[PDB]
Symmetry: D2
Subunit: 500 residues, 4 copies
């Protein structure tokens, strides 16, 4: 097995940076009833601070318009939708991690678009008009939400401009020009608004180096660096899905650690660092996302990720997504922590379990995290992902947890391939594309972790836990102080009940 | 083990008489927020048609009042509370199985009361005034709810008048006088209103014989017979609780069968028969009610009870009860199917599981019920209660269920001492009398049955199920037709996912 | 003034055909949270049976797709969205008055589109593929909702094919070919499904004549005729709005009466007739829709319209609309009975008031409707729209209403330019485009009719009502029987209260 | 008329002391669904900080019990109900202004009770047992709610001990003994808990003098003085109601000012002062409470009361009351700001209107209050109660309000005998005792103030308001800055709409 003796003293500290932000589909989809039910649902379980998605400036949200009064062409800024959208984000208690872009149609210089919803990926045919666009939006936000509020929303400029698909010809030099005009426009409204970039994705860190040199040398303000991180190798698309190999979690944590260095060695060594987007597969159609595997895999990233970054946003919170057309089945490898019909995927409970963690970090290794809360209670999260096809995935443990109590109440929650695996049951049902109300209900019933309570006594100050982790399992133990009130029940004796 | 080959043809039929009615605490408690949340909660899971409780005429509901205008003493009927009460019963979609009584204070002839809330158990000092009371209430009901509605509410006269505690000196002859004056008063308002009695409890069936002879001979209208049934022997009260031996279920079913005969041999052989109240222990403080045992025990009664009676009301739906003062702990042996804070006891899921049963009864024995629904799907409920203290409570099964399909989707739900046993966890926690919000949450999380899906194939038209029932376990299997859509997912291959 | 003596006897009868159906924006918008809140809101006030809108087959709903597996091109029908959409329609208790169309992109033969959302207006490049599309959808509906349900949904083929904008070159002969292939496809699935057309709009009734001759002669099944009706003359668009003259209501009622004749003189004289769309202005940007005028104007149509048609659907129930891009202000002349943020426009209360009408029609003239309910109570609705710019819009009345009671309780609700005129207040506020939460609240507070109760006595069986209707006012009077219980309050005397 | 020129500069300041606390029926009634719906309803409109009521220790809540184990008699403290009660108070966001008392049955020394619910009004037969009772409760509160929370709850000892009905023989010397034992018991648990008294009612201030001398001389801790205030003269009870003359508001404000002096001249000159209970009539059956008069009368007290006291609690928030048996009609002169079925009485809107007031008090006289909010907007509340039976109750005004804007948006809300007078309509209906669902709905529809918006321009910095106050009327004007956006609507011209 694997024996461990969790030390009674706290050296390091565990932060809630893992729940600072979550990813989402384009802001236009936030108008959907399904979207908001899920957001509320998710917020009642995980207290994410911000939400990050594309499309703020796309035409479905329809902010940028133009009116013709003869020969005169004046721009018109329509806020009917982002108002409703941002109003609903705040109502639920979540701030927007604004991402400026993409390029509105009546402002584009080219015709290249991206995704099924076709967002324009070309630069403005007139940066002057673009600058006024940006300023008109911020002023409006300030106008409706107050400067104190807006001041808390960071502004990421564009998305993966290092890719030909998101930025015309990956024109690095043009991006920096976009960054400057926008960073300037924003700071014009209020010098305190947070702005950053480059929003690139793994495999072009030189972009961040140039991005930071560019700002220093051209005197462009930067408030934070932005980047994405995934671990899926190349795969070939089916007209339905893609399967990819997932590199171990270690390689993502290195990318975090790496880009951290590039920042501390730049002219802005103290800039905050935000992984504005992460997950295993970078495709909205890879079933890895629906598997109990994805949950055990991410478990580690939530465990260590916060040591190197200021925040890392899981892409995404819901399957309400359209980049590759409308989903075509209950389960389809969508990014979301929650599937359609608010059916929590196992990855959802990994996040849920981390709500149990406390400030004091007592122990931690590649597959386990043990912390202590304010009240003195302890919580442990172990996870056993199976990266390969082993015959014996199992893993036994025997952890000695220190406890300031003698009588310990134990609450155990388990998530593996047999528990909290709606995807597995979906298969049992025959992979229905459009399940019926009852199939959906059965799924919802299955989509809950297994809970086991118990009650042991800690001797010599330590409680010894023994347990086995099945394939891709993830377990959480919360050990609190048990204060028995049994002696208060005059005549209490369960043995006086038939069979007990 | 125990092998069974469920026949493919249906002889007998299974009815929903088991869910016709449920018991409740005095109607005054229906004013409590806690009460109504629980009623709604329960109705969303079990479609009970009627609700039966005492106190309609007690003073907390305050219908009967008297005003003094000098020497003149006129009665005043206050409907502020039963209006709200009955309005809320209908809003939720449940009809009242009205029980006239007890005796209001300003109408009583004695001072003897019953229960902690002290309901007057003496006859009216003036049956004339009582008759006008009854008529004024019915007219009001008719007035607010319409005659079509009221016409559906049966009226039970008094409660266990065979006991000295509920009726002064158990005056049988006086009861019949009460019955007549009331039965007459009611029929005066509308000859179609349903009325019956004697509402006695086990061990005095001669009361029903005399009750029926009395009506025939004195020409008093009867529309239904009423009686209670329990199976707890004598026990000694603690200032906190009582423990009692529970006689096997067979003896309750005999009482049903028995009183059935007494009716078919009377002058009114076709009168409907209502067990307006039943359960294992007749005390609101016997922990048997909170145990997974009670659930497995009642399972049988829900299985056969309907063969002999028109309805049998489980006493009660909630622990919102006060007969023996306010409860003093999360679990205290209350009658309710649901404990305070809407925590379902295991007995609750027995009822829940029976919602799965269909009209066609294929097989049935002392511990198992197997039926078929309209769609052709099959549902099975097995139960293994442990009446004694055996070392090997287990019981294996191997049932051959006939199926009109070849591909079968299976949904299994299990309730035993390890699953859906909040009471057990309550013990783990140290029997807290006033649990904290989180203890209550853990309980709610534990208070759900275990669900397992799977997917086998039926060969030769039969699917073979093998399974073990632990101590006091109760399981439900729903076998529906599995229509696989997997071939629609181009390139679908789970083996292309890390570890699968 | 205007004196009237409502006769005590009922000749004609008033039907609820006015609430059979309502219009809506494209079905895709039904995915919006805003949309559904409003639908629920509206359904709680007006019991519309069906809802009619375009876009069932447009690409945002995304039903029609195509997968490429080499050289093989197989079609794929995605039901993820209409399932959610139709599921939510039924959840709220409203049936879809299905309108097949428009033309999906991967099936179109041309490139001509209509509206801001660009629905393809060209015929299929292969009617064979189109026929399979239609059949696949109906089978799916049957599959999820059951044949008994679907059988209640009528199917209208296309929209205004008489206009070059909705049908390529208004090819009448091509439309009939579309109608036939579709009507055949539908009837193939189930011979009982209701289907009809031509869905034309005023000024081309010859289309209905040819449509009916075409079906008779070519043996194409028809189950109902479909047409639209508006009364707005030509107007010139602004890049923001359009103003149009509204012809009196008489001309719309004639169009109803007219097309009725064309049907009774055809080969199908008994076919039902549905005005699947109506209102004053046919533009989603004419402020007439937001004015208390529109409410008084439609009042008449709800009064007489049902005499000539089987149903007439008000276009539309909500301002959640996108035909002319996203709205750009709280009030913008949208079709909806309800403005964004669920602010009821005055037209909404006209419909609300008609919920008061009963079966027995006692009196009716060009500006007043008087009916009697089952209980014998009477309800009156008078309205005074101002079509021109008069100096004295007022109108006095003096109606003698017959009453089976002597003591009458009166409930009066008034809607005019001073009451229930959110639009007016919006102006007061300075026409904010994006009102704040409180501005929206004030509007919601203003957006309610004025209510006045009173209590007179009917002498000689008649109650005399005297009242004045302001500009565009609309009033409703409900006279019920007052049963005074005052004598039950011993010592009741309001004059014993300071000042009374 | 009455001309006034509100000064542009702020001398005095207006506080929210008027909304610090509200009265309630005994805590046991807080278990009622009706009670809590109303509390929530009320809290969504008025942000009361605390809630004060009797019965914490009465037997329906059932805290104090005793178990017999032979000859041994140990006390048992049951917290099942106050837990639910206080839990629900905090859930809604309202703190309890705890009032210790009355005397539990198994602790009483006499048999004298008070009210329909019979609370024991005799002292403990053993102060030792009583002291342990108090301490056990506080420890439990601390235990479940945390010391930081409980520390915010003030503790008032007993109720009107100056009356023979609430304290045996009004034994002043015994009360002080009660006060000491309790004040000591409390301070034992935590020296910081707030405690005070004497809770007397008008006409015995010498009690407060002795109470303060008693504490100083006997060294008993005091943290606040407590007293009640009413203005209803003697009246004679009917078996249904009582009518009383209401002395002008001036006399209540004097009582406030008076008792203030008695405190500043005592040995504890800085003790806070709480009018833990006030209203016009001190009877739960005087229709004055339901009249628009009561609303205009209290308007003044909310205006000036805060100048002399730390808080004054309106008795009560709801008609959910039982002191004089269960109410017997929709309107019955109950204390509540809200009648049963959540129908706001006019007094409710007086409180609602004061939510509009700001910190800066610009002007104030016996019938008007004018303030300015942070944003610079102004709000005015005028009221015209009719104390006598005048032929001309009317009162004209002409106020000059200073405004930092030129374009002013006006929102006017009016409450008088014709608007927001459910009681009046109730009369119209014939004073139904048990209204039907629709009668209740009409009432709810009538029970709203009249709102009128408008839009004028302020010249020379002042806006001139002219208006008439009807009988017992109460009006609120909120003048905010109007920022017109009309010029943004290209082609906007309402005159192009039929009739405009
Ligand atoms: O939009 C997402 C993009 O930002 C990321 O880089 O790759 C995955 C996509 O879903
Ligand atoms: O009130 C119930 C009574 O009717 C029954 O007979 O015994 C149990 C009690 O709870
Ligand atoms: O879509 C609608 C169309 O059907 C009708 O004919 O004209 C008005 C439009 O909004
Ligand atoms: O209980 C209240 C009492 O405290 C007060 O003094 O008089 C009115 C009563 O309702």
């Amino acid at each position: 097995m694997i024996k461990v003796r969790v030390p009674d003293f706290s050296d390091k500290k565990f932060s809630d940076r893992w729940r600072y932000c979550v990813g989402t589909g384009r802001l236009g989809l936030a108008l959907q009833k399904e979207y908001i039910e899920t957001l509320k649902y998710v917020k009642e379980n995980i207290d994410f601070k911000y939400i990050r998605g594309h499309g703020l400036l796309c035409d479905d949200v329809g902010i940028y318009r133009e009116d013709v009064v003869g020969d005169e062409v004046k721009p018109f800024y329509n806020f009917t939708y982002i108002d409703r959208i941002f109003d609903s984000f705040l109502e639920i208690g979540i701030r927007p991690f604004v991402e400026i872009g993409f390029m509105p149609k009546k402002l584009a210089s080219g015709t290249q678009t991206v995704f099924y919803w076709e967002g324009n990926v070309t630069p403005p045919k007139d940066y002057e008009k673009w600058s006024d666009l940006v300023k008109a939006v911020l002023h409006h936000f300030i106008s409706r939400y107050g400067i104190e509020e807006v001041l808390k929303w960071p502004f990421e400029i564009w998305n993966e401009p290092n890719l030909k698909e998101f930025w015309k010809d990956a024109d690095e030099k043009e991006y920096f020009k976009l960054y400057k005009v926008t960073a300037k426009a924003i700071k014009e409204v209020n010098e305190n608004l947070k702005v950053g970039g480059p929003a690139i994705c793994g495999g072009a860190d030189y972009w961040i180096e140039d991005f930071l040199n560019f700002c220093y040398e051209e005197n462009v303000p930067v408030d934070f660096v932005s980047r994405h991180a995934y671990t899926s190798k190349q795969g070939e698309y089916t007209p339905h899905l893609i399967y990819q190999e997932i590199m171990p979690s270690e390689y993502m944590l290195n990318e975090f650690k790496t880009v951290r260095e590039i920042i501390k060695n730049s002219h802005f060594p103290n800039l905050p660092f935000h992984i504005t987007e992460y997950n295993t597969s970078y495709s909205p159609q890879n079933p890895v996302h629906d598997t109990p595997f994805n949950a055990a895999y991410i478990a580690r990233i939530l465990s260590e990720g916060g040591d190197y970054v200021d925040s890392f946003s899981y892409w995404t919170f819901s399957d309400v997504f359209e980049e590759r057309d409308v989903p075509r089945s209950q389960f389809h490898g969508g990014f979301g922590l929650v599937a359609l019909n608010m059916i929590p995927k196992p990855t959802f409970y990994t996040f849920k379990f981390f709500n149990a963690m406390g400030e004091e970090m007592l122990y931690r290794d590649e597959h386990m995290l043990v912390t202590r809360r304010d009240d003195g209670s302890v919580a442990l999260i172990a996870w056993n992902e199976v990266m390969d096809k082993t015959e014996n995935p199992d893993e036994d443990y025997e952890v000695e947890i220190p406890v300031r109590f003698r009588d310990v109440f134990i609450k155990r929650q388990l998530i593996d391939e047999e528990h909290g695996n709606p995807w597995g049951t979906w298969i049992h049902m025959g992979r229905p594309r459009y399940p019926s109300k009852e199939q959906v209900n059965t799924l919802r019933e299955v989509a809950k972790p297994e809970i086991m309570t118990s009650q042991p006594v800690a001797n010599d100050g330590y409680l010894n836990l023994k347990f086995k982790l099945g394939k891709n399992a993830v377990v959480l133990y919360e050990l609190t102080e048990r204060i028995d009130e049994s002696s208060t029940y005059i005549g209490l004796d369960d043995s006086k009940i038939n069979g007990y």
